[PDB]
Amino acid sequence: QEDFPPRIVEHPSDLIVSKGEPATLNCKAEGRPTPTIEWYKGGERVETDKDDPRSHRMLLPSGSLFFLRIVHGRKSRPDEGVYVCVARNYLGEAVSHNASLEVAILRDDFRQNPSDVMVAVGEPAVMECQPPRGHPEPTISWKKDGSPLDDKDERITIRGGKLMITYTRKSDAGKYVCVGTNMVGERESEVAELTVLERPSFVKRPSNLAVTVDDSAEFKCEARGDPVPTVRWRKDDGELPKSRYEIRDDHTLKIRKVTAGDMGSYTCVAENMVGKAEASATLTVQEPPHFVVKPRDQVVALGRTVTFQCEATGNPQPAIFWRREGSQNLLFSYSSSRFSVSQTGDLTITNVQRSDVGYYICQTLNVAGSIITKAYLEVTG
Ligand SMILES: *[C@@H]1O[C@H](CO)[C@@H](O)[C@H](O)[C@H]1NC(C)=O
């Protein structure tokens, strides 16, 4: 067929190429005679090996341009740019579509590094990140203690450049890093430790104690929490007894040679940086009984009613009971008879008879002590 002008069949395609690696910008054209190919970087002639065999750019018989390496530095940049191939034969000129030849880049320092988080168990946890500068744009991923982290958990959600934990479990604690990845490689960010702190609480709390005079007293107290909580005893109404207290290694409070006045309430206090827990117990000093009111010997006329007063005060409130001098039968606060004992301790004999004559013993007792006193009854006409 009679000679024809050039017609570009294949055009050069845009290309992003890794730091120092060969590149190929394809360009095929038809025409008779075979059209000579020339490359132009923004209109300027590209000096190839088919111009000077010292240039790192090679023009192929297939009309394609091969780059043996990519030149990108702080002083020179002759490979990066916009290219067009031109097919020229006996009569005619063909110009192709343009193509880009950009160097792939990925910097070191991050646009935003993940920061540490100190939360309580259950509180949500968020982590912010932005990858280091890079073209094409780097893709964000996360790692927990070397191993890669997944969105798989219902709570864990990775969106854009954020990490969200809806509720924290102790198991989420650890060292976290943000990974930026494009074609150049990977960049692992700065370590952002996440700590799951527990508020203070009591494993074993104090028990209310009743202890008599001169005996020692013990109040047990064990606490938990992360970080390990400091444990310190209080005295709600004053201070601890100088030279009479001792805080053991187990955290238990001991008051030696107890004397009334110690009688009150003591508090165990557990405290850490995330919270504070308190627990109370009372100490009961037990004083032996003493007679407020003692019965007095009295004469009652036949058939009338007599009351013998007996009132006592001790710690705890001491119980009271009567008994006739020779008898075994003990009289308490209610079968019924003419004899009765009031709640406060008084004995009342109703419709008296000559048989009722004699001493009536009053007896008070509590865990600490016991006291006795009597009074005579004289039945007359
Ligand atoms: C590349 O071709 C486009 C048309 O697709 C044109 O807009 C642009 O100016 C050309 N680029 C250069 C640097 O000449």
Residue numbers in the entry: 63 to 396, 401 to 447
What does the paper say about this structure?
Roundabout (Robo) receptors provide an essential repulsive cue in neuronal development following Slit ligand binding. The Drosophila and vertebrate Robo1-3 are most similar, containing five immunoglobulin (Ig) and three fibronectin (Fn) domains in their extracellular region. Here we present the crystal structure of Robo1 Ig1-4 and Robo1 Ig5, together with a negative stain electron microscopy reconstruction of the Robo1 ectodomain. These results show how the Robo1 ectodomain is arranged as compact dimers, mainly mediated by the central Ig domains, which can further interact in a “back-to-back” fashion to generate a tetrameric assembly.
The Robo1 Ig1-4 domains are arranged in an extended conformation, ∼170 Å in length, with essentially no polypeptide linker between any of the four domains. Two potential N-glycosylation sites at N160 and N175 were identified by sequence analysis. A close inspection of the electron density for these residues reveals clear glycosylation at N160, while N175 is most likely not glycosylated. Nevertheless, four crystallographic contact interfaces are observed. The first results in a dimeric arrangement between 2-fold symmetric molecules along the b axis, and is primarily mediated by the Ig4 domain. This interface, which spans residues 378–394 and 429–436, has the largest buried surface (663 Å2 of each molecule's surface area), and is predominantly hydrophobic in nature. The last interface, which buries 466 Å2 from each molecule, is mediated exclusively by residues 71–72, 86–96, and 122–126 from one Ig1 domain interacting with residues 79–84, 115–120, and 128–131 from the second Ig1. Both interaction surfaces partially overlap with the Slit2 D2 binding surface on Ig1, but Slit2 D2 binding to the first is more extensive compared with the second. Several independent ab initio runs yielded reproducible molecular shapes, and the average models generated are consistent with the Robo1 Ig1-4 structure obtained. The fit directly computed from the atomic model of Robo1 Ig1-4 yields a very good agreement with the experimental SAXS profile and a χ2 = 1.4.
